[PDB]
Design an enzyme around this catalytic site. Structure first.
Site, short mmCIF file in Angstrom:
data_model
loop_
_atom_site.label_atom_id
_atom_site.label_comp_id
_atom_site.label_asym_id
_atom_site.label_seq_id
_atom_site.Cartn_x
_atom_site.Cartn_y
_atom_site.Cartn_z
CB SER A 58 -0.93 0.02 1.19
OG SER A 58 -2.00 -0.83 0.92
CE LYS A 61 -4.36 1.38 -1.08
NZ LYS A 61 -3.79 0.16 -0.52
CE1 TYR A 144 -5.19 2.69 3.38
CE2 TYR A 144 -5.56 0.35 2.96
CZ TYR A 144 -4.74 1.49 2.90
OH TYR A 144 -3.49 1.42 2.34
CD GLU A 266 -3.19 6.52 6.91
OE1 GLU A 266 -2.67 6.04 7.94
OE2 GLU A 266 -3.77 5.80 6.07
CE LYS A 309 -1.28 4.16 2.83
NZ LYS A 309 -1.40 2.90 3.60
CB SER A 312 1.56 -5.10 4.64
OG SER A 312 2.01 -4.42 5.80
#
Ligand SMILES: [Ca+2]
Ligand SMILES: [Ca+2]
Ligand SMILES: [Ca+2]
Ligand SMILES: [Ca+2]
Ligand SMILES: [Cl-]
Ligand SMILES: [Cs+]
Length: 357
Positions: A58, A61, A144, A266, A309, A312
């Site tokens: 991720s 992203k 999410y 985040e 962030k 995994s």
């Protein structure tokens, strides 16, 4: 040096969590330090080195968000416009009411976490999007979502009139100098592709799947990710528009309890307690819908925050932390999916031991 702080913490981490290998990048003014530990593949003992490719899941992203932000900076994508304006095949669906910004902040009306089984390709994916009914108030709730960031990717590609991967390469990876960053690892580099280790100690490697490139599909080095972090910290030479696009990914868009949701990134105001960080990486935040309040005083990128962030796959565990106020960043890649709590603790101890918190 820095290594006298870093090395004991990563040795202890790798022993406690039984991580075969890691690649770590520490970004600071005055420069970037890359460190490699252990084995890229536990079975062969091939060491982790400068060429070792890790699945980042991720963390991918963040690149999807960055490309989206560049399309926005170039005036090709309006972040608040309905996604159906750029994907007309979704006209008449919920995506008349959901924006690219919603998708980048996981506030797209409860769009679910995983691509469903019955979606096996682009056509069935688009048919699924057309039929899907929002389950949460759009722009008021965070879930999410791989489906969401995936669609931002599709939206972005359409807005740029290009295919996602080559466009990502030309507009983001290449100008950042990220030449060891792959969506599909070529045969010539397979000997450098680390083998993952899952929670049972078994070899594993990510499989292809729908929206893989957009949501989780990058394989890369710690050094390449450090270039992205350097740019986020204003330490790189990048053209004005790409810098602007990168900076915009750190704009705060929603308050979600103690967390601020930026564009995929985040963040938390400083000082931040590790417990708060832990609560951001657990069941309550990741696997339940959370109330989200739009910041329409649209928050300028902050200099007094912890930005992070996780990423995994079944066999890999990655974490990026940035402290813009200290112009310092940390990239930790592992070929084991080890607990997010331990990622947070190690990152905190490192940054604290370096005097950055
Ligand atoms: Ca607009
Ligand atoms: Ca090699
Ligand atoms: Ca793909
Ligand atoms: Ca502890
Ligand atoms: Cl998925
Ligand atoms: Cs490449």
């Amino acid at each position: 040096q820095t290594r006298e702080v870093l090395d004991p913490i990563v040795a202890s981490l790798m022993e406690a969590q039984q991580i075969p290998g890691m690649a770590i990048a520490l970004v600071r003014p005055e420069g970037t330090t890359i460190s490699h530990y252990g084995a890229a593949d536990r079975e062969t003992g091939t060491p982790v080195d400068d060429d070792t490719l890790f699945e980042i899941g991720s963390l991918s992203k963040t690149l999807t968000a960055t490309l989206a932000s560049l399309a926005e900076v170039e005036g090709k994508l309006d972040f608040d416009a309905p996604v159906s304006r750029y994907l007309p095949e979704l006209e008449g669906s919920a995506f008349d009411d959901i924006s690219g910004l919603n998708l980048g902040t996981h506030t797209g009306g409860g769009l679910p976490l995983f691509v469903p089984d019955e979606v096996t390709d682009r056509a069935s994916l688009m048919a699924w999007y057309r039929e899907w009914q929002p389950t949460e108030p759009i722009g008021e709730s965070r879930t999410y979502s791989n489906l969401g960031i995936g669609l931002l990717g599709l939206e972005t590609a359409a807005s740029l009139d290009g295919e996602f991967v080559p466009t990502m390469r030309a507009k983001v990876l290449a100008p950042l100098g990220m030449q060891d960053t792959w969506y599909d690892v070529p045969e010539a580099r397979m000997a450098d592709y680390a083998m993952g280790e899952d929670k049972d100690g078994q070899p594993t490697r990510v499989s292809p799947g729908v929206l893989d490139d957009e949501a989780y599909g990058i394989k890369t080095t710690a050094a390449d990710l450090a270039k992205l972090v350097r740019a986020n910290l204003h330490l790189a030479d990048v053209d004005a528009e790409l810098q602007q696009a990168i900076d915009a990914t750190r704009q705060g868009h929603y308050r979600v309890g103690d967390m601020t949701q930026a564009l995929i990134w985040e963040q938390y105001s400083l000082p931040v307690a590790p417990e708060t960080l832990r609560a951001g990486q657990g069941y309550d935040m990741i696997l339940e819908p959370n109330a989200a309040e739009a910041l329409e005083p649209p928050q300028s990128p902050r200099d007094d925050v912890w930005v992070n962030k996780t990423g995994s796959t079944q066999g890999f565990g990655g974490y990026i932390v940035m402290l813009p106020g200290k112009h310092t960043g940390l990239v930790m890649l592992a070929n084991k999916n080890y607990p997010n709590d331990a990622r947070v603790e190690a990152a905190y101890r490192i940054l604290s031991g370096l005097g950055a918190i």
